[PDB]
Paper text:
The lead structure, compound 1, represents the molecule with the shortest distance between the two interaction motifs: only one methylene group separates the tetrazole group and the hydrazide (n=1). In the structure of compound 1 bound to KDM4D, a clear positive difference electron density for the ligand could be observed and the ligand could be modeled with 77 % occupancy. Its hydrazide group chelates to the active site Ni2+, which is a surrogate of iron. The mode of chelation is very similar to that observed in the binding of the natural 2OG cofactor.13m The aromatic tetrazole ring is sandwiched between the two active‐site aromatic residues Phe189 and Tyr181. The distances between the tetrazole and the centers of the aromatic rings are 4.2 and 4.9 Å for Phe189 and Tyr181, respectively; thus indicating an aromatic stacking interaction. The distance of 2.6 Å between the hydroxy of Tyr136 and the second nitrogen atom from the tetrazole ring indicates strong hydrogen bonding. All of the other nitrogen atoms in the tetrazole ring are connected to the protein residues through clearly defined water molecules. Superposition of ligand 1 with the 2OG‐bound structure shows high structural similarities between bioisosteres. In brief, ligand 1 was the most potent compound, with an IC50 value of 46.64±0.94 μm in a formaldehyde dehydrogenase (FDH)‐coupled assay. In the antibody‐based LANCE Ultra assay, the potency was as high as 2.38±0.37 μm.
Numbering used by the authors: 11 to 340
């Protein structure tokens, strides 16, 4: 068995290997990459996403979200307070202001330590989930707005035609902006490209061990757990690497830099934080290997997790016994 310790693998496809997206995801899985829950893909040197990021400042962040924490430094929740609209240029200026700017630090490890020591004491502002794309239309390889749709994948695998659309999202980050522990909707894959700016640090639990994380989360966030049997889908809980190690939870970490792709695999729980001003693009995707995961994915039916219209068909077809209850939650 490949990658039995579930390490995060890093891949360097050639330009030729970068042509067929689906083929390369299957190749990475052949090497055991999926066992980790996350892989890094460094594009060939001949590749670029777009020509320059000089002209992005006018993009609107309609609802920037202030991420306010509650709890203790290693075990906290965050809630998203809505703020007034601003442009990407205005956001960038805010991110670089003394109130929000990355502190002086020695290296990624020193910054990580600062993050987990001091995150709760600040409330950074995040531009998330903005439908759009920064790939140029002429970029033919690894263009996150041109990948095979999940709807077509379901059709191809199981023979039925469903409604829905699958488009990418943009994210504008700043120091301390945080993504809580989660798997994707319906335990889909995700792919994430860091277009510009400062790094993003990732934590990930191997899929084969995702229930260990769930069990610790239920222990650490007892009220939330009583509220919903799939509360991690609310995307608000944070647990530090120190606390994960104290509790014996298998996990790995890696830092993504601008120009790099990260793929998350089905049922790979992940969390992390941005180092400073950045912009990323991401989208969920499927492969034939996902179908089994989709059929088995937990769902949140308490109301809190609210999701895209596209989800409906995936629950309806893959999880008919659960559909009525999930729909009520919606
Ligand atoms: N799937 N990708 C992630 O969860 C990464 C992310 N970064 N900001 N919000 N989420
Ligand atoms: Cl700090
Ligand atoms: Na490890
Ligand atoms: Ni994710
Ligand atoms: Zn819920």
């Amino acid at each position: 068995a490949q990658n039995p310790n579930c390490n995060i693998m890093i891949f360097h496809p050639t330009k030729e290997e970068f042509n067929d997206f689906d083929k390369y995801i299957a190749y990475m899985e052949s090497q055991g990459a999926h066992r980790a829950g996350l892989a890094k893909i460094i594009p060939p040197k001949e590749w670029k996403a777009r020509e320059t990021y000089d002209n992005i400042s006018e993009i609107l962040i309609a609802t920037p979200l202030q991420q306010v924490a509650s709890g203790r430094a290693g075990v906290f929740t965050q809630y998203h307070k809505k703020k007034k609209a601003m442009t990407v240029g205005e956001y960038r200026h805010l991110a670089n202001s003394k109130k929000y700017q990355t502190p002086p630090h020695q290296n990624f490890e020193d910054l990580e330590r600062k993050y987990w020591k001091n995150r709760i004491y600040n409330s950074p502002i995040y531009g998330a989930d903005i439908s759009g794309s920064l790939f140029d239309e002429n970029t033919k390889q690894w263009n996150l707005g041109h990948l095979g749709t999940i709807q077509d994948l379901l059709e191809k695998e199981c023979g039925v035609v469903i409604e829905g659309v699958n488009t990418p999202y943009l994210y504008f980050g700043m120091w301390k902006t945080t993504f809580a522990w989660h798997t994707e909707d319906m335990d889909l894959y995700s792919i994430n490209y860091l277009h510009l700016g400062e790094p993003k640090t990732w934590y990930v639990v191997p899929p084969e061990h995702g229930q260990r994380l769930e069990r610790l989360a239920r222990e650490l966030f007892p009220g939330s757990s009583r509220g919903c049997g799939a509360f991690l889908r609310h995307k608000v809980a944070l647990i530090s690497p120190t606390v994960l190690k104290e509790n014996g939870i298998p996990f790995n970490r890696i830092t993504q830099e601008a120009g790099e792709f990260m793929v998350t695999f089905p049922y790979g729980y992940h969390a992390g934080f941005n180092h400073g001003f950045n912009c990323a693009e991401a989208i969920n995707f499927a492969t034939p290997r996902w179908i089994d995961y989709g059929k088995m994915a937990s769902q949140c039916s308490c109301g809190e997790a609210r999701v895209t219209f596209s989800m409906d068909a995936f629950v309806r077809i893959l999880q008919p016994e659960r559909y009525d209850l999930w729909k009520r939650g919606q």
